[PDB]
Amino acid sequence: DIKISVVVPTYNTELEGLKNLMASIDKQTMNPDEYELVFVDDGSTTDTYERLQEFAETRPNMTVKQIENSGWGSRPRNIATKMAKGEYILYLDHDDTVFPETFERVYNFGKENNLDVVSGKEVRTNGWSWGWKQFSENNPHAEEMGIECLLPMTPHKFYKREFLLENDITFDDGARVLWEAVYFNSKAFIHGAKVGILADYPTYYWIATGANSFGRDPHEKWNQINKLFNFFKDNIKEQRDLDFMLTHWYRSRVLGILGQWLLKNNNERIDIEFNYAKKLAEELIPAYISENLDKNNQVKDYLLRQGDLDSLKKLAQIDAGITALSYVEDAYFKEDKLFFKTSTKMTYEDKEDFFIEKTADRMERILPEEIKSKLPKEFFDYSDDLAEFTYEPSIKGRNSRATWKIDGSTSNVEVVNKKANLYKIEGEMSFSVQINDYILDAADKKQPWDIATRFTGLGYTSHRALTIGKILIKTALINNKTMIVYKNASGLISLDVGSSVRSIVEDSGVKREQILIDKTSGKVTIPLNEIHVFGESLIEGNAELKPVGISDADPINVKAKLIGEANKARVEVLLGDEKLSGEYHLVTNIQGKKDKQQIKITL
Amino acid sequence: DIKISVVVPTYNTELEGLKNLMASIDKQTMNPDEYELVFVDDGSTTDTYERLQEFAETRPNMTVKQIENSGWGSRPRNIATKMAKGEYILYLDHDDTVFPETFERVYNFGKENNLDVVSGKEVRTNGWSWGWKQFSENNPHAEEMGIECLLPMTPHKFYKREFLLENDITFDDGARVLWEAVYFNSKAFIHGAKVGILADYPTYYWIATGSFGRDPHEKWNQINKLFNFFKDNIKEQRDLDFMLTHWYRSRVLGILGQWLLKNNNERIDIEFNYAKKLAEELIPAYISENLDKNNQVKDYLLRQGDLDSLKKLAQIDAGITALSYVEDAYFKEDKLFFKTSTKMTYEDKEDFFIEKTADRMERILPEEIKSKLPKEFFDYSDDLAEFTYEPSIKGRNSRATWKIDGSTSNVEVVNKKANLYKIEGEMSFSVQINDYILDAADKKQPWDIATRFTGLGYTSHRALTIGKILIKTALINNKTMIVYKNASGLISLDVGSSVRSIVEDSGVKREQILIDKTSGKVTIPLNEIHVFGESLIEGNAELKPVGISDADPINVKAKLIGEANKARVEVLLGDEKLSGEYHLVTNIQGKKDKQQIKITL
Ligand SMILES: Cc1cn([C@H]2C[C@H](O)[C@@H](COP(=O)(O)OP(=O)(O)O[C@H]3O[C@@H](C)[C@H](O)[C@@H](O)[C@H]3O)O2)c(=O)[nH]c1=O
Ligand SMILES: Cc1cn([C@H]2C[C@H](O)[C@@H](COP(=O)(O)OP(=O)(O)O[C@H]3O[C@@H](C)[C@H](O)[C@@H](O)[C@H]3O)O2)c(=O)[nH]c1=O
Ligand SMILES: [Cl-]
Ligand SMILES: [Mg+2]
Ligand SMILES: [Mg+2]
Ligand SMILES: [Mg+2]
């Protein structure tokens, strides 16, 4: 009885990525006999099919099959879905990887809640967030929130196989189709799929490769956009779900070219896509959709229907550079957490303040008179929107690429009158980091982490790395965790845990005049200078001794321990049975990171 | 009568720089028969001496003589000085150039005021200022301010030849001596030299191109020799106190700040012990009274040998700066108006703070360091009104820098949170570009704007910046002016279409374009532009039919006219018969627009 079937369409697959893919599947905690691998090669010109057969020699649950070239992976996925015999289907691309506990966690969550679709937390290489809203916390009954529960609509979820067949849910293999997973996930919800969101564990890694061009030209792009919008209006029968998909895709893909997109494209490309977007808004988008959009997007929709492209270009110049960068006001360790105080304000490129202007009873967007004398009065009136600001912290593992919201933060955003009638938008936030909240695999215990802040307001979303101007290096030894918060070479805030990029002995310093040598016991005690120590810690390492002067001598390897107790830290070096006379260099090697403290001892 | 003798020592001279130097001399407005050239070759292992006398064939007043290699240009200058015969002497290095009106302006200034030394305004390739204090306005009685009037003490001044001989003032002829011109300029002042500061015109260009004093032991042997020279030869209390204070602060205390963070520990311990010994042996205690709080802290910890506290203080001070943002920029009448703001920060991020306790405004320091220092040295209370905030401008081609005058500024110490106080500044100023155009080349040049902020011992002179897009054009009295945010995000003023096309940035009204078949004049009005006064710029345009792929272009004549607060371009079709739609690009001052203009003829 097979629980999970892994559908993998392959075509000229990069071998190293294929080896990583096979590795991540082998590392699954689920028993290998409870799952199966269904590979379907899309007629690879290279030796991809021969390699897939070589992988299948040592794995009896892996089934390989080759088909004619089809151009995309929807047909290979369909053939593999019919060959598959597991309760749940995962559509894994040939250049992605799966986290080691995904199968057991996802199946248990779906089986216990009788889920037809398990939308598990997905990780991407770049960016500070992915599925920030949906991958917040677990939701066994996510379909009760509407079709939004399936966003982001990648095919990298788990689908109950019998549910797909009972409703004839396949991939669009009739022709080349952009966003084929939006059709797929939407069809699932249209047929009443019980959807659950598994957000407490990274299930899938969507890897960026650089080699990742159909639809790049403007005509096939808007041909697929018209095809996707028609599908929404024709297949989605629930009004709330239809209005959501219409609003979400009109805002992101149609109105999404009416802002900064206008400043990085030539005129003849703008005209083709502006006219395409104008006809689509008139023919397919009802007017009530824009009535529940934000002020700035209402302006874009209004001018689009007027054909006022020149005003949208001028607005794009006015809006260029708006952002919110957070500065570290304070950063320190207290007990077993790292504490932060951050501040931010809306600016143009971390420089002069962004302003809104107060006129009588309205807080208005600052616009030229030519543009204001064309828009409805309410479209640039931010008065009723000044209480929707959010200011939150996030974290990203530099190895796993997984991103998380940091819970428990305290933030506040004020609108402050700076000069005359101009108002700036200021934020203050304090939060703490408990690194155990984000360590889910064993590999997470040794990793550098990067801190970011997420600010939203007046339609703007700014998710940037946390930064600081002054030098910042602070260390901690907390319950067997070496921790270093520091300003990296880019001026951003990083947190090394487990000596993955820095040495805690180097960054803490050594009280070199306080080093103790016990000749009879052979112990050398090296107390650390500046470090926050909480709880008991013992990390085994080693040290190397070299005679001073004899620059070519073999290193004398010797046991060493990094100890944290009574709020103090030290490295104990054990000379053991080594007979030593003279002066020696001493270099500690804790967790693979050596120090540069120039330690010399005389024996 | 030879008015000026130009002394030039050469050794393995780069040929293209030697050509630029000679051309710099031939372009002088002074009669060539009133100056002479004295080139002394310090045993060049290249062929520059042969190429020197090549230049002496067509130039009669150029004397060229070779000596054995002395190692640096002290002996070649002394040999050229003796065999020279001019009234004033300029020491011109073989890789520098001199501005065209320098000889005339400097000599007239020295003759009219009987100056022994004319300290002309000097220009360097990099930086936002040079001689910011001394090169303000012209001063024919500069020696009345003290020895300070000769700073910066480069050898690139004009010295009366009679004065140097009547006092045996030469360069040190022995082994290499660092700051050879500080001895020279000091010895000139000690003998009561009539010093004049010519600041209204850039006279000398000290060029940065692609050494003794690199090892720490010889460095501090030279620093010791320099300080002993001041104490032994300077006889006026005010002059000695100045040179001691200035060089103790810049070269001795100057290694006790950020220098500690970009050097290895073994060199730090060498120079620190040298600096501590020199302060104890040569620097009286009262000199430190003339210093600011931060330098008084440095001096105190130096004399205590507390290098570790100095290292900690260096990390705390690392990154303190003041960047100015543009709050407003507009054209009014014949000038460009600016409004900027700044605050002291770390790397233009979080604020720099000072902390209030009782009635004291204190530098924020760790308790371990404050306990080691006298209370007054970290109390800023008496310094809270000593802030300067001024604008500056730099020609990108001439590399000349000027202070922009007429500015209004105001720096405030503001309570931000609890008892923390930040330092905020605001400034208004206008740019009259006529103030900085002195040579014909200065009319077509991009100008870079910067701001100068000082306070609490810190100096921050860096380019002005803006975040939002800024492009504003003006046509003011035959000057095309475009203030803009450059690719680096810094404020630049293009004058004369040196970088940007004014038509492309002004915008063209493609519906008000007129095509007059009677006279054959296509009028292309400009949209967003500022027009003051009357102006007319000659140019040309280019035609090409829309249909043909690579049709030969048809060139014409265009003109950029500014009148009645309006600017327009007039294209003259000439006598060519044309038919159909034609592309049309303009070319005013060598800049073609990208407006994609079509006319149906
Ligand atoms: C090209 C192709 C792919 N496939 C399979 C290979 C994978 O299993 C699956 C998905 O392909 P991937 O390259 O992993 O998808 P991707 O989403 O990572 O790549 C995409 O990024 C866009 C930004 C670029 O325009 C394209 O490179 C596009 O393919 O499709 C076929 O089966 N047949 C084919 O002919
Ligand atoms: C070496 C040498 C130079 N000279 C001349 C050449 C110049 O006219 C003058 C000074 O040399 P310049 O290269 O013009 O120096 P400079 O003052 O322009 O720049 C200096 O900057 C210092 C930071 C470097 O350590 C020096 O090596 C030098 O590059 O001395 C001699 O006459 N004889 C010599 O043997
Ligand atoms: Cl530029
Ligand atoms: Mg992929
Ligand atoms: Mg030189
Ligand atoms: Mg900033």
Comparing CB atoms, the residue among B348, B349, B469 nearest residue A320 is B469
Please tell me whether residues B297 and B358 are part of one structural domain.
Answer: no
Q: Do B468 and A350 touch (CB under 8 A)?
A: no
Residue A126: burial class (beta carbons within 10 Å; 0-12, 13-18, 19+)? exposed
CB B296 within 8 A of CB B458: no
Please tell me whether residues A590 and A460 are part of one structural domain.
Answer: no
- In the structure encoding, which two tokens stand for residue B49, read together? 């001496």
d(CA B520, CA B538): 17
d(CA A120, CA A131): 10
d(CA A20, CA A16): 6
Half-sphere exposure of B380 (CA within 13 A, CB side): 23
The β-bridge partners of B390 are B452
Asked if B315 is an interface residue toward chain A (Cβ–Cβ < 8 A), one would say yes
Q: Which of these, A278, A305, A461, lies nearest to A376 by C-alpha position?
A: A305
d(CA B370, CA B373): 5
Q: Provide the strand spans (E) within A365-409.
A: 390-397, 403-405
- In the structure encoding, which two tokens stand for residue A16, read together? 């190293």
Q: Which of these, A493, A308, A269, A536, lies nearest to A395 by C-alpha position?
A: A493
Q: Do A352 and B467 touch (CB under 8 A)?
A: yes
Point out the ligand 1 atom lying closest to the alpha carbon of residue A211.
27
Q: Which of these, A603, A601, A602, A599, lies nearest to A588 by C-alpha position?
A: A599
What percentage of chain B's residues is helix, strand, coil (to nearest 5)? Answer: 30, 35, 35
Neighbours of B525 (CB within 10 A): 18
Neighbours of B358 (CB within 10 A): 6
A206, A229, A259 - which closes a domain: A206
Please tell me whether residues B90 and B9 are part of one structural domain.
Answer: yes
Residue A82: burial class (beta carbons within 10 Å; 0-12, 13-18, 19+)? exposed
Q: Do A347 and B467 touch (CB under 8 A)?
A: yes
CB B88 within 8 A of CB B156: no
Q: What is the per-residue DSSP string for B26-79?
A: HT-SS-GGGEEEEEEEE--SSSHHHHHHHHHHH-TTEEEEEE---SSTTHHHHH
Method: X-ray
Q: What is the resolution of this structure in A?
A: 2.5
Domain that holds residue A37: 4-206
- In the structure encoding, which two tokens stand for residue B91, read together? 């020491």
Q: What is the per-residue DSSP string for B214-245?
A: -SHHHHHHHHHHHHHHHHHH---HHHHHHHHH
Tell me if B206 is assigned to a ligand binding site: yes
Which one of A323, A352, A353 would you mutate to disrupt binding with B, by most B Cβ within 10 Å of its Cβ?
A352
CA of B349 to the centre of ligand 6 (A): 5
CB A80 within 8 A of CB A38: yes
Is A201 in a helix, a strand, or coil? Answer: strand
Is residue B279 in a domain?
yes
Which one of B349, B484, B485, B598 would you mutate to disrupt binding with A, by most A Cβ within 10 Å of its Cβ?
B349
Is A429 in a helix, a strand, or coil? Answer: strand
Residue A268: burial class (beta carbons within 10 Å; 0-12, 13-18, 19+)? exposed
Q: Do B349 and A327 touch (CB under 8 A)?
A: yes
Is A353 in a helix, a strand, or coil? Answer: strand
CATH number, domain at A416? 2.60.40
Please tell me whether residues B301 and B347 are part of one structural domain.
Answer: no
Point out the ligand 2 atom lying closest to the alpha carbon of residue B69.
35
Is residue A362 in a domain?
no
The β-bridge partners of A396 are A403, A450
Q: Do A471 and B348 touch (CB under 8 A)?
A: no
Would you say the CB of residue A76 lies under 6 angstroms from ligand 1?
Answer: yes
d(CA B111, CA A124): 76
Q: Which of these, A122, A178, A127, lies nearest to A150 by C-alpha position?
A: A122
**b/e per residue, A345-368, with b = 16+ CB within 10 A?**
bbbbbbbbbbbbbbeeebbbbebe
d(CA B158, CA B103): 10
Q: Which of these, B243, B21, B207, B214, lies nearest to B127 by C-alpha position?
A: B207
Is A272 in a helix, a strand, or coil? Answer: helix
Q: Which of these, A586, A595, A529, A531, lies nearest to A557 by C-alpha position?
A: A586
Q: Which residues contact B432 (CB under 8 A, 6 or more apart)?
A: B334, B335
Q: Which of these, A139, A147, A124, A114, lies nearest to A199 by C-alpha position?
A: A139
Which residues of A contribute to the annotated binding site?
9, 11, 42, 69, 77, 93-96, 156, 180, 206, 212, 327, 350
Half-sphere exposure of B448 (CA within 13 A, CB side): 22
> What's CA A545's distance to the chain center, in Å?
43
- In the structure encoding, which two tokens stand for residue B208, read together? 């940065």
Give the position of tokens 């002005």.
B464
Please tell me whether residues A441 and A329 are part of one structural domain.
Answer: yes
CB A599 within 8 A of CB A586: yes
Q: What is the per-residue DSSP string for A72-136?
A: SSHHHHHHHHHH--SSEEEE--TT-EE-TTHHHHHHHHHHHHT-SEEEEEEEESSSS-SSTTTTS
d(CA B532, CA B433): 14
**In Å, how far are A24, A109, B189 from A203, measured between CA atoms?**
11, 12, 80
The β-bridge partners of A454 are A392, A463
Torsions phi, psi of A103, nearest 5? Answer: -60, -50
Q: Which residues contact B552 (CB under 8 A, 6 or more apart)?
A: none
CATH number, domain at A82? 3.90.550.10
d(CA B288, CA B256): 15
Torsions phi, psi of A535, nearest 5? Answer: 75, -175
Q: Where are the alpha helices (DSSP H) in A250-327?
A: 267-284, 288-291, 295-306, 309-319
Is residue A363 in a domain?
no
- In the structure encoding, which two tokens stand for residue B332, read together? 């009014």
CA of A345 to the centre of ligand 3 (A): 29
Q: Which of these, A20, A21, A28, A39, lies nearest to A3 by C-alpha position?
A: A28
Please tell me whether residues A67 and A130 are part of one structural domain.
Answer: yes
d(CA B559, CA A562): 79
CB B223 within 8 A of CB B252: yes
Is A69 in a helix, a strand, or coil? Answer: coil
Helices B265-282 and B216-233 cross at an angle (nearest 10°) of: 10
Is A383 in a helix, a strand, or coil? Answer: helix
Is residue A457 in a domain?
yes
- In the structure encoding, which two tokens stand for residue A459, read together? 């339609």
What is the torsion angle, in degrees rounded to the nearest 10, for the CA atoms of residue A367, residue A372, residue A377 and residue A378?
Answer: -40
Q: What is the 3-state secondary structure (H, E, C) of B485-498?
A: ECCCCEEEEEECCC
Q: Which of these, A486, A455, A500, lies nearest to A592 by C-alpha position?
A: A500
CB A88 within 8 A of CB A3: yes
Q: What is the per-residue DSSP string for B316-350?
A: HHTTEEEEEEEEEEEEETTEEEEEEEEEEEETTSS
Torsions phi, psi of B376, nearest 5? Answer: -70, -25
- In the structure encoding, which two tokens stand for residue B132, read together? 């910011």
Neighbours of B236 (CB within 10 A): 12
d(CA B301, CA B87): 50
CATH number, domain at B589? 2.40.30
Mutation choice for ligand 1 from A72, A91, A154, CB with most ligand atoms inside 8 A: A72
B292, B318, B344 - which closes a domain: B318
CB B345 within 8 A of CB A469: yes
d(CA B201, CA B101): 8
> What's CA A9's distance to the chain center, in Å?
25
Neighbours of A83 (CB within 10 A): 15
Please tell me whether residues B325 and B309 are part of one structural domain.
Answer: no
Is residue A155 in a domain?
yes
User: Which residue is closest in CA terms to ligand 1's atom 24?
Assistant: A212
> What's CA A328's distance to the chain center, in Å?
22
Please tell me whether residues B143 and B272 are part of one structural domain.
Answer: no
User: Which residue is closest in CA terms to ligand 1's atom 25?
Assistant: A213
Is A421 in a helix, a strand, or coil? Answer: coil
Q: Where are the alpha helices (DSSP H) in A475-563?
A: 504-508
Q: Which of these, B564, B483, B579, lies nearest to B525 by C-alpha position?
A: B564
Is A543 in a helix, a strand, or coil? Answer: strand
Provide the residue count of chain A. 603
CB B244 within 8 A of CB B283: yes
In sign, the C-alpha dihedral spanning B411, B415, B417, B419 is: positive
CB B471 within 8 A of CB B505: yes
A497, A523, A544 - which closes a domain: A497
Q: What is the per-residue DSSP string for A208-253?
A: --S---TT-SHHHHHHHHHHHHHHHHHH---HHHHHHHHHHHIIII
The β-bridge partners of A397 are A449
Nearest CA in chain A to B312: A471
Q: Do A351 and B315 touch (CB under 8 A)?
A: no
Asked if A416 is an interface residue toward chain B (Cβ–Cβ < 8 A), one would say no
Q: What is the per-residue DSSP string for B408-425?
A: EEEEEEEEEETTEEEEEE
The β-bridge partners of A546 are A585
CA distance A468 to chain B (A): 6
- In the structure encoding, which two tokens stand for residue B345, read together? 């920060």
CB B538 within 8 A of CB B559: yes
Residue A285: burial class (beta carbons within 10 Å; 0-12, 13-18, 19+)? buried
Cis peptide before B545 (omega within 30 of 0): no
Is residue A158 in a domain?
yes
What's the structural domain count of chain A? 4
Strand (E) or helix (H) holding B565: none
CB A580 within 8 A of CB A603: yes
> What's CA B260's distance to the chain center, in Å?
27
Point out the ligand 2 atom lying closest to the alpha carbon of residue B75.
32
Is B509 in a helix, a strand, or coil? Answer: coil
Is B364 in a helix, a strand, or coil? Answer: coil
d(CA A395, CA A123): 13
Is residue B190 in a domain?
yes
- Chain B CB contacts of A317 under 8 Å are 469
What pairing do the DSSP bridges indicate for beta strands A195-206 and A117-124?
A: parallel
Is residue A224 in a domain?
yes
Q: Do A468 and B345 touch (CB under 8 A)?
A: no
Which long-range CB contacts under 8 A does A288-291 form with residues at least 24 apart?
A: A288/A243, A289/A243, A289/A246, A289/A247, A289/A250, A290/A250
CB A90 within 8 A of CB A203: no
Task: Give residues 443 to 472 of A whose Cβ lies within 8 Å of B.
Answer: 467-471
What is the torsion angle, in degrees rounded to the nearest 10, for the CA atoms of residue A144, residue A145, residue A151 and residue A153?
Answer: 30
Q: Which of these, A44, A119, A2, A86, lies nearest to A18 by C-alpha position?
A: A44
Q: What is the per-residue DSSP string for B420-486?
A: EEEEEEEEEEEE-GGGG--SGGGGSEEEEEEEEEEETTEEEEEE-B-SS--EEEEEESS-EEEEEE-
d(CA A168, CA A191): 10
Nearest CA in chain A to B321: A469
Give the position of tokens 């493609």.
B510
Q: Which of these, A342, A304, A303, lies nearest to A325 by C-alpha position?
A: A342
In sign, the C-alpha dihedral spanning B69, B71, B77, B82 is: negative
Helices A267-284 and A295-306 cross at an angle (nearest 10°) of: 100
d(CA A241, CA A103): 30
Neighbours of A267 (CB within 10 A): 12
Please tell me whether residues A313 and A328 are part of one structural domain.
Answer: no
Residue A326: burial class (beta carbons within 10 Å; 0-12, 13-18, 19+)? buried
Please tell me whether residues B127 and B35 are part of one structural domain.
Answer: yes
Please tell me whether residues B202 and B145 are part of one structural domain.
Answer: yes
Please tell me whether residues A157 and A185 are part of one structural domain.
Answer: yes
- In the structure encoding, which two tokens stand for residue A568, read together? 């103090």
